[PDB]
A paper describes a structure:
Chloramphenicol (Cm) is a well-studied ribosomal peptidyl transferase center (PTC) binder and growing evidence suggests that its inhibitory action depends on the sequence of the nascent peptide. Here, we use cryo-electron tomography to analyze the impact of Cm inside the bacterium Mycoplasma pneumoniae. By resolving the Cm-bound ribosomes to 3.0 Å, we elucidate Cm’s coordination with natural nascent peptides and transfer RNAs in the PTC. We find that Cm leads to the accumulation of a number of translation elongation states, indicating ongoing futile accommodation cycles, and to extensive ribosome collisions.
Focused refinements on the LSU (50S) and small subunit (SSU; 30S) of the ribosome provided maps at 2.9 Å (with the core resolved to the Nyquist limit) and 3.2 Å, respectively. The in-cell consensus map resolved to the data limit of 2.7 Å at the 50S core enabled us to investigate Cm’s binding and coordination in atomic detail in the context of stalled native translation complexes. In the PTC, 23S rRNA nucleotides (A2459, C2460, G2068, A2069 and U2512) form the binding pocket for Cm. The base of C2460 (C2452 in T. thermophilus and E. coli) and Cm’s nitrobenzene ring interacts through π stacking. In addition to 23S rRNA, we found that the elongating nascent peptide directly interacts with Cm. The side chain of the residue at position −1 forms a CH–π interaction with the nitrophenyl ring of Cm and the residue’s main chain N atom also forms a hydrogen bond with the CL1 atom of Cm. Moreover, we found that the residue at position −3 is involved in shaping the Cm-binding pocket in the native translation complex, restricting the pocket at the side facing the nascent peptide tunnel. We modeled the nascent chain residue at position −3 as Lys, consistent with a previous functional study7 that revealed a more pronounced translation inhibition by Cm upon accumulation of Ala at position −1 and Lys at position −3. The lysyl side chain is located at a distance of about 3.5 Å from Cm’s dichloroacetyl group and can be stabilized by aliphatic–aromatic stacking on 23S rRNA nucleotide G2513. We were able to place a corresponding K+ ion, coordinated by 23S rRNA nucleotides U2512, G2068, G2455 and C2509, 4.1 Å away from Cm’s methylene hydroxyl (O4::K+ distance).
Author numbering:
A (entry chain s): 2 to 96
B (entry chain a): 2 to 286
C (entry chain 0): 1 to 48
D (entry chain m): 2 to 120
Write the structure that this text describes.
RNA sequence: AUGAGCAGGUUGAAGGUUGAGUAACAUCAACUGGAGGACCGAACCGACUCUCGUUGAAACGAUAGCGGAUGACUUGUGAUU
RNA sequence: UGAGUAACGCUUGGGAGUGAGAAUCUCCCAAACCGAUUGACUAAGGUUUCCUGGACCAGGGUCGUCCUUCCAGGGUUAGUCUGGACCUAAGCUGAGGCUGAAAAGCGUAGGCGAUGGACAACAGGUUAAUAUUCCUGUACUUACAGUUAGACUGAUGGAGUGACAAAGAAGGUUUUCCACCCCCAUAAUUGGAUUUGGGGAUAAAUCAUAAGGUGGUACAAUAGGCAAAUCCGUUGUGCAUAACAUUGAGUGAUGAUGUCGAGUGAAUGAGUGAUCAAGUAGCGAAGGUGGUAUUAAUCAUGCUUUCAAGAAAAGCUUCUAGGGUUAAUCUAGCUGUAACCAGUACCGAGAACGAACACACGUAGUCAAGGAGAGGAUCCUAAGGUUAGCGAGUGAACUAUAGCCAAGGAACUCUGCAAAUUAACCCCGUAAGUUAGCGAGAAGGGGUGCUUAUGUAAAAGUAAGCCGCAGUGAAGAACGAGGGGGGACUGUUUAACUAAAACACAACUCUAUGCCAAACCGUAAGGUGAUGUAUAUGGGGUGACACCUGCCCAGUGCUGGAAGGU
């Protein structure tokens, strides 16, 4: 509802491999406390097309910059893979 | 009766003997009634604190407790029929699955001599002197075998419940109550008038002559090895230490916890049941 | 050979965890002392 | 001291000679250690002089030494030896191969040697 | 408390059936049956011996033999003193 | 300093290339070990160690252009898998409450707690890294609403099922395997070749058919199941070679004009060429008949026997209660809507885990190829995987591991310690003693190869012939006899110097204990003993089996005792 559960879209080799060929799959990063139903509602209230299904990924934090004078940990990410129906492809930028 | 076991396994020789359980039991199969079946949790000789309390206990096989009607007072005035004599792993004596006229089922300690189809009946009037009939001690003629004697009136059977256990009636007392009962071990007691008991000797009279042939059989029965005190360290037992096989050394044998224990009497004479005892297997009171 | 420490994620958390320490007076005293020493790893719960 | 390495066994030595001689017959040059070239030279010369008659008995004798290489098989190495290499040395009184010493290796300081077919 | 494991091959008990036998028992013969803290021997468990090692590959092992291997057996997970 | 000394912790050769520099990096060809494993799937643990590109401060027992090291980017997709939203075992917590100087201990109702129970998805493909998760194909399950038809609905409670031990042997059906046949490639210069090598597959789900397995079936009365009952239990009657109820591996048809498939095999582009590209994309034939006296899997939570007598709850079915009657609820069908949370990478160990080390150690389960073989033993290899992260020489003394040693054969030594002989299968034969079970694989001997013929379903065997010094020709297989001491035996014990005569064990005896039992943990509550009852429990001593166990009650210990003295 508040639509703070759609933080940032991400574009990788896997994302672009899926984002072509009829059904498009758009991968965003979401609030780690959000659920699939909240993700579908946010896409409804901010894009307008009902997702066909949603898949979720949790990437655990890991050590980064190891051996550097001050080592640091990573940040917890939840990834969401929305898939719109056949023949529809909306743009992530431009509204 | 008893039947020998011929192992013919060439690792020692053991003339093991077991109860037949074939000509004494109706069906050799193990088919207990589901309704009266609760499972027993093996304490292993450990109290609620988890510490070993009674030594040499632990390691028995899984058992399911069969609910036994020691009271036999709920369905009074109702004729019961024995249906099967079965094996109870929690007591040396066989148990009979009896059924009442109304359709209720129960387990009772099986009297010796009864077979399938023998009628039973309990109440608080004369009834009849038949094996298995349970009546209060007031109406039993003196001389008959009785088991499942109730100490506290309206309670359950407590005395003479093991295999082949019985007690004889030895008249009454001038008090108008405390009927005399001559029990096993040559002890004479005074049981209250209202107390209820069952006539007949308990079955499985040949449980004395069963001979275990192996350590494993006794281990599966639930007995752990008992270490003698002479083999102990000078710590953990008074009879320890020594240089070689040593005698007791003290003035008398001692418990692991250090008391005399030999010939000494350990009965609390300041008990309300002392006045109800005529002999204590040795003499008066 | 079987060495002394055989790691287990459950046994560790159920023996030296925060909830285990916060169930008895002795554990509360231990946690108070560790706060006095300002240990970053107060208990084994904060493995990361 | 135990659980030692198998070592430079006699079987290993024969296999090493077999591999180097098969390669030197296939390509024509071998860059090895000097003490290994000085031992492969004997077998190389023996194979070449026995392969001068080209009868089936001589093929059976050579096949107990030749091994498969990248440039030729065990059957095409036979054709190369009996039709191309050996006929060249038809009246040379021995000494078909030369061993010359290169510099020491960077990681061993062992003396390298190139073994070649002397034209 | 709840689960799992013991490759493979032998010996052939009690009991039962049949026949002879007995005045009827007992006993004997054949067949069935497959018991044993049974036997040989892998995984598995254990550690009896020689040698090596003793600033080790190793704060207790390696090679070669060795004992048990359906049981008072071995082991995983969880609880507890 | 020792000292540039010991050590560098099980695995080879060559060709081409990169690079400033190569035994150590990449590719190729061999070579050597593993192959009941160094192969493949995962649990636990580890926590990014996984993939790509770059680098060679440090780490790698050498080197390094390379790494499980460092830098940058990326990688883990679930209604059906593993766990919660379901249930309980040991046990933990535990309002009240009991006990206790205090802190606290015990404990009822409730609540947690898998290593167990219940619950719906299979086949193939795809990326450098994920796949019962993504894609394709075909399915299933649970909720909610509308609708059609039928039916009275029936639980927080009652009952049944769920629900179970060990060992053993028979069957039924698929298999393994054997024989034939089909298809593909091959036709061989070293003497002869008329052949050689490889493949023969399809799941969940739906429908029909099911070898069989389990247990008697209906009717009538009921006083018992914290009320009620049409359900259960009980009592009678009829029919009971069967009927009825439930369950059931396999078979056939869709799923499948699909997928997989031996092999054939590019183009495109990189490159000086080969080669890569790649042996990749694509193409892709047959995709079967009979037997079995051989195999393993399932039916099977099936059956039989034995004593040591072998989990609970949820769930499912059913019963009324309780609610409806001008209704609700349930069943079957159609349409639509929804299916949450956590894990999913990689290793899984002579380099990712526990051992400080890229340490010869240890770590649950699952798949298990061929030949000979009883075999998962043994030797060599298949699918697959590795190159034991210091090398090159030499072949002194000396050491470790092996092999052999003429004549003698324990003369060696504390002692045949160690080493050596035997070893598998088949056929003969086998003593003293005994608790009649054993001793016993006793001791002692013989045969094993290949060919032909006879034997069989296959054998085994039998007869003749041939070769060698030797024929389970190699690997893996018990040395034996006699007398004595101790322990009856099988077992257990000092993790890391003592495995034994020590401990234990079945058995004997004494003693205490009448149940709120004796004994024991605590201070007490509480609890073990025991949901047991003298044929039972605790303690002391002895330790199969057989024969015996003698005298002393002065002292000590124990039991009992009239009075009397203190
Ligand atoms: Mg997920
Ligand atoms: Mg005892
Ligand atoms: Mg006892
Ligand atoms: Mg001692
Ligand atoms: Mg003392
Ligand atoms: Mg003493
Ligand atoms: Mg002495
Ligand atoms: Mg060799
Ligand atoms: Mg045995
Ligand atoms: Mg110094
Ligand atoms: Mg120096
Ligand atoms: Mg020196
Ligand atoms: Mg030196
Ligand atoms: Mg050295
Ligand atoms: Mg090394
Ligand atoms: Mg090497
Ligand atoms: Mg090999
Ligand atoms: Mg492996
Ligand atoms: Mg790291
Ligand atoms: Mg990499
Ligand atoms: Mg790189
Ligand atoms: Mg270096
Ligand atoms: Mg799906
Ligand atoms: Mg739970
Ligand atoms: Mg589980
Ligand atoms: Mg992978
Ligand atoms: Mg030819
Ligand atoms: Mg009632
Ligand atoms: Mg129950
Ligand atoms: Mg994986
Ligand atoms: Mg290892
Ligand atoms: Mg490690
Ligand atoms: Mg190493
Ligand atoms: Mg394992
Ligand atoms: Mg094999
Ligand atoms: Mg092997
Ligand atoms: Mg020799
Ligand atoms: Mg010789
Ligand atoms: Mg000699
Ligand atoms: Mg001689
Ligand atoms: Mg001598
Ligand atoms: Mg001498
Ligand atoms: Mg010896
Ligand atoms: Mg003998
Ligand atoms: Mg003597
Ligand atoms: Mg012994
Ligand atoms: Mg022993
Ligand atoms: Mg020791
Ligand atoms: Mg020892
Ligand atoms: Mg008390
Ligand atoms: Mg109790
Ligand atoms: Mg003794
Ligand atoms: Mg003795
Ligand atoms: Mg005496
Ligand atoms: Mg006296
Ligand atoms: Mg006295």
């Amino acid at each position: 509802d508040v639509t703070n559960v759609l933080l940032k879209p991400v574009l990788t080799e896997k994302v672009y491999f899926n984002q072509m060929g009829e059904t498009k799959k758009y991968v965003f990063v979401v609030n780690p406390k959000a659920s699939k139903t909240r993700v579908k509602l946010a896409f409804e209230l901010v894009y307008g097309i009902k997702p066909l299904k949603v898949n979720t990924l949790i990437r655990k934090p890991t050590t980064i910059r190891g051996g550097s004078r001050f080592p640091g940990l990573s940040k917890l990410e939840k990834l969401a893979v929305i898939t719109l129906p056949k023949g529809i492809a909306i743009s992530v930028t431009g509204e | 009766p008893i039947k020998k076991i011929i192992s013919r396994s060439n690792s020692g020789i053991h003339h093991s003997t077991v109860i037949d359980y074939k000509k004494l039991l109706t069906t050799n199969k193990n088919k207990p009634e589901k309704s009266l079946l609760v499972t027993l949790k093996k304490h292993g000789g450990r109290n609620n604190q988890g510490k070993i309390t009674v030594r040499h206990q632990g390691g028995r096989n899984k058992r399911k407790y069969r609910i036994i009607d020691f009271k036999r007072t709920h369905y009074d005035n109702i004729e019961a029929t024995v249906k099967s004599i079965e094996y109870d792993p929690n007591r040396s004596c066989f148990v009979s699955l009896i059924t009442y006229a109304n359709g209720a089922k129960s387990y009772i300690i099986s009297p010796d001599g009864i077979k399938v189809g023998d009628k039973i009946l309990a109440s608080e009037h004369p009834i009849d002197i038949k094996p298995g009939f349970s009546m209060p001690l007031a109406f039993i003629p003196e001389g008959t075998q009785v088991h499942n004697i109730e100490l506290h009136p309206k309670g359950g059977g407590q005395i003479a419940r093991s295999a082949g256990s019985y007690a004889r009636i030895l008249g009454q007392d001038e008090t108008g109550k405390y009927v005399i009962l001559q029990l096993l071990s040559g002890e004479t007691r005074k049981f209250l008038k209202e107390c209820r008991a069952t006539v007949g000797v308990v079955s499985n009279l040949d449980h004395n002559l069963v001979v275990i042939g192996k350590a494993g059989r006794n281990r599966h029965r639930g007995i752990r090895p008992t270490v003698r005190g002479s083999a102990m360290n000078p710590n953990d037992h008074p009879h320890g230490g020594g240089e070689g096989r040593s005698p007791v050394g003290r003035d008398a044998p001692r418990t692991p916890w250090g008391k005399r224990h030999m010939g000494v009497k350990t009965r609390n004479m300041k008990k309300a049941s002392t006045n109800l005892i005529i002999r204590n297997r040795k003499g008066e009171q | 050979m079987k060495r002394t420490y055989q790691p287990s994620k459950l046994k560790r958390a159920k023996t030296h965890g925060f909830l285990a320490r916060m169930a008895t007076a002795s554990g509360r005293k231990v946690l108070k002392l560790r706060r006095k020493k300002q240990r970053a790893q107060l208990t084994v719960s904060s493995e990361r | 001291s135990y659980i030692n390495k198998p070592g430079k066994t006699s079987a290993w030595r024969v296999m090493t000679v077999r591999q180097q001689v098969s390669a030197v017959l296939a390509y024509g040059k071998i860059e090895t250690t000097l003490k290994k070239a000085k031992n492969t030279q004997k077998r190389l010369d023996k194979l070449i002089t026995l392969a001068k008659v080209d009868n089936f008995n001589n093929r059976r004798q050579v096949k107990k030494w030749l091994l498969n290489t990248n440039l030729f098989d065990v059957d095409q190495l036979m054709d190369h030896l009996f039709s191309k290499v050996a006929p060249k040395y038809e009246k040379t009184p021995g000494g078909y191969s030369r061993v010359l010493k290169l510099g020491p290796r960077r990681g061993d300081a062992t003396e390298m040697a190139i073994l070649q077919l002397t034209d």
